[PDB]
Scaffold this active site. Structure first.
Site: not given
Ligand SMILES: O=C(O)[C@@](O)(COP(=O)(O)O)[C@H](O)[C@H](O)COP(=O)(O)O
Lengths: 9, 481, 139, 139, 139
Positions: B176, B202, B334
């Site tokens: 991030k 990742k 979330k």
């Molecule tokens: O882009 C994002 O928001 C995340 O990197 C969350 O990061 P955080 O850990 O900072 O929340 C993931 O890609 C989501 O979880 C995808 O959703 P899902 O797994 O439901 O497909």
């Protein structure tokens, strides 16, 4: 109900 | 005239329009075969339309029928190729919703091809004027057809062996912020996180090749960070390199580069498409790489209960294509996720056989014909303060990922990684000793006790103590007990 | 440096009572247990040395504890680990592994970098203990 | 020259009684019958012109004989053939075909040889009747 | 055979009043009109012969009708067509085309089949009128 398991052998 | 004298006068093959249910697409006394493909649809008829006619229309338009009679049918074994509606029932606690079961002959599909299967089941039926809404809830894929597909390239068992890691969930994190960082700054975060104790990091789903950072630069710096961390800890480590691109040629170019530098894993996005996904899964098996699948775009059609495709069906199709990991939900994070539906998803991806379980959304019994298992991934606004809940709902074969829950630590990225690993180790130990870690009091105390020997963990617990996401779910069950 | 292989390496060294409990958990599942030893801790060193055959139908942790006690007083300085195997269709692999004995001190590893085409590097991980002494006298 | 396409071309032209018997044999099997016409007899000319729709549930050769009689007095000089189709799973194709009318004279064909790489030749088969007149006036 | 090139070939030959109306429709849009002629009707024959320059700013169908009348009494037996062009950004191409004169008789075409690798055929479409006489004396 339980007829869904007998209708689909 | 010769044409006028040779006109068909048969009641069934004379020109004109007749109901689909009188064309041979409805058969209540149909006997199902073990080679047949089956589908369950939730249908909502337009005011005035008969429930049985709607089911017959869906079966005909998804097999060999059209809006009017055609004599060309007599040049084929018509009865064998027609799909057959055989059961229709009202949805409980609902008026205007009905469940419909439909059977399809094995010879209708091309061996080993997902594009072909979908072209028939979801091609045009969802746009029919006579229905107001429609949803594919489940499918029974027979043993004979399963044997024409590869299945996961690596599989959960071979993957744990490649990492020498057994008996606990794997750990990870996303870099991030989502966009803006350079290749050198990207490698720094990877080095720090891994060194603190993560198994993997990742790239975000939207990181590919942009003006602020070209892909070749990112891949080089990441391999320096991985080797540094592995040499400092004595463990095998890795990072998911993103090979998503605009054309197949560019995808292959990025896959061959990652293999050359010695990456153990790579990642792809769902927006690429079924045909590109199948090609990538065949490449990974032939080149000894692990393949991770991000499900970008799935919620455009899998969120509402009245229309679209249920995620449990997507789970089956992707296990058939042969991906090694897939995002499947967190329950307490979330993003959307009902606990009963989520437990259904995990079972579809890890079991050797499925038995009927209505409260979980399992409508068909089905064996996996020895296809390898796919590893579920849990991600989205979760923190070490919720460890007791994660262990109880998600199980032991899963990758728990913490993005903001790691980089957002006040004492640095290495500190964040340590707090997450310690929390997990203490919870599993306690579980194996026979404690009630899920109780609203035992669980947190266990973490508090561990915190009195680890400052980072103490800091994290105090920071995200009152953090939760409580909202009514959209996709829910229709049965109880 | 502390070697972080195994499922409980971020926790302090476990006591004998702690070890016995984990064994009791694996036998309640019906798993087979075994004990291994090595003085080369490279992360790609897959085959550690076997201490006897695996205990297949033993239904009492005391039998496992006894064997570990013997190895401790019989083997040279190095590392010891306990593994659990599940032969059920769909698995047929190891399902648990943790370290249960360490050397007085471990120096760790360092990296060697060979430069190939363009900017590519071929990496090699090297152990201080291995490069210095033969097997049996590394710790 | 005599065109040798069909199953009975090494026998003399068949009489109406002979034709009726063969039709009676195909209907006893449950096959569908049809009649076709053409003035281009190239061996790769797969689609002859259709004379009405196929007779699916007709159970009397007299109906087929009548249709052939009409075509004979209605179509231009050329060739006529009768075919039988079987729509059973495992077949779904034609199972019989024979000629039932010929032109007064058929000149035949000749070969053209284009020389390509090395000693390879690309062959083309050519019809005298086709090259000379448009459809409708070839015979 | 009737050549089916053009937008109104499935309708009977149009009268002079009919032609004038279609012209009146194209000029109301602001299109440029022209007249062409040929005696080779192959479907890949893109360039017919031009009859003078295109009429760019003519705002009266009578001018177009006059030119067509001249060609009719001046050109040899064959085909005549009227085209409309739109030079607007985004188009810059023809937007209408129809036949307005035909020969007394058109024999049509036939196919030649050269056999190449495996089962592949290279096809050639041939005109009876062209192969028989030089330009100017084909009809
Ligand atoms: O882009 C994002 O928001 C995340 O990197 C969350 O990061 P955080 O850990 O900072 O929340 C993931 O890609 C989501 O979880 C995808 O959703 P899902 O797994 O439901 O497909």
């Amino acid at each position: 109900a339980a007829e869904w398991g007998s209708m689909n052998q | 005239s010769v044409s006028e004298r040779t006109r068909i006068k048969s009641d069934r093959y004379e020109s004109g329009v007749i109901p689909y249910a009188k064309m041979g697409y409805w058969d209540a006394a149909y006997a199902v075969k073990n080679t047949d493909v089956l589908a369950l649809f939730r249908i909502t008829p337009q005011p005035g339309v008969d429930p049985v006619e709607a089911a017959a229309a869906v079966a005909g338009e998804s097999s060999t029928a059209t809006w009017t009679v055609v004599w060309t049918d007599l040049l084929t074994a018509c009865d064998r190729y027609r799909a057959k509606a055989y059961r229709v029932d009202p949805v409980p606690n609902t008026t205007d919703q009905y469940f419909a079961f439909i059977a399809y002959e094995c010879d209708l599909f091309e061996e080993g091809s997902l594009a072909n299967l979908t072209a028939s089941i979801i091609g045009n039926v969802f746009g029919f004027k006579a229905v107001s809404a429609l949803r594919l809830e489940d499918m029974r894929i027979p043993h004979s057809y399963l044997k024409t597909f590869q299945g996961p390239a690596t599989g959960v068992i071979v993957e744990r062996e490649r990492l020498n890691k057994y008996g606990i969930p794997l750990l990870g994190a996303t870099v991030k912020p989502k966009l803006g960082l350079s290749g050198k700054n990207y490698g720094r975060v990877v080095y720090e996180g891994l060194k603190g104790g993560l198994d993997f990091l990742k790239d975000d789903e939207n990181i590919n090749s942009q003006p602020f950072m070209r892909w070749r630069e990112r891949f080089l710096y990441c391999m320096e960070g991985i080797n540094r961390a592995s040499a400092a800890t004595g463990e095998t480590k890795g990072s998911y390199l993103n090979i998503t691109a605009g054309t197949m040629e560019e995808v292959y170019k990025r896959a061959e580069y990652a293999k050359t530098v010695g990456s153990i894993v790579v990642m792809i996005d769902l927006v690429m498409g079924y045909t590109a996904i199948q090609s990538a899964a065949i490449w990974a098996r032939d080149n000894d790489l692990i393949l991770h699948l991000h499900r970008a775009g799935n919620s455009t059609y899998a969120r509402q209960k009245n229309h679209g495709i249920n995620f449990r069906v997507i789970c089956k199709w992707m296990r058939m294509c042969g991906v090694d990991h897939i995002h499947a939900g967190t329950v307490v994070g979330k993003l959307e996720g009902d606990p009963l539906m989520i437990k259904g998803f995990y079972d579809t991806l890890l079991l050797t056989h499925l038995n009927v379980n209505l409260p979980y959304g399992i409508f068909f019994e089905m064996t996996w014909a020895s296809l390898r298992k796919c590893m579920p991934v849990a991600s989205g606004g979760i923190h070490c303060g919720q460890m007791h809940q994660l262990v109880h709902y998600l199980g032991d074969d899963v990758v728990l990922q913490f993005g903001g829950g790691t980089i957002g630590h006040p004492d640095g990225i290495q500190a964040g990684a340590t707090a997450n690993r310690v929390a997990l180790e203490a919870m599993i130990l306690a579980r194996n000793e026979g404690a009630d870690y899920f109780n609203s009091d035992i669980g947190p105390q266990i973490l508090r006790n561990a915190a009195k020997t680890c400052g980072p963990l103490q800091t994290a617990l105090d920071l995200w103590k009152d953090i939760s996401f409580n909202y009514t779910s959209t996709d829910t069950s229709d049965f109880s007990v | 440096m502390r070697l972080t292989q195994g499922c409980f390496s971020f926790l302090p060294d476990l006591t004998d009572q702690q070890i016995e409990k984990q064994i009791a958990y694996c036998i309640t599942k019906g798993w087979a247990m075994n004990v291994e030893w090595t003085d080369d801790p490279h992360p790609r060193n897959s085959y550690w040395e076997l201490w006897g055959l695996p205990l297949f139908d033993v239904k009492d942790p005391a039998s496992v504890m006894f064997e570990l006690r013997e190895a401790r007083k019989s083997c040279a300085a190095g590392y010891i680990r306990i593994n659990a195997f599940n032969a059920a269709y769909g698995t047929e692999s190891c399902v648990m592994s943790f370290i249960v004995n360490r050397p007085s001190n471990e120096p760790g590893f360092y990296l060697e970098r060979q430069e190939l085409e363009g900017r590519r590097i071929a990496y090699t991980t090297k152990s201080y203990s291995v490069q210095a002494n033969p097997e049996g006298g590394r710790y």
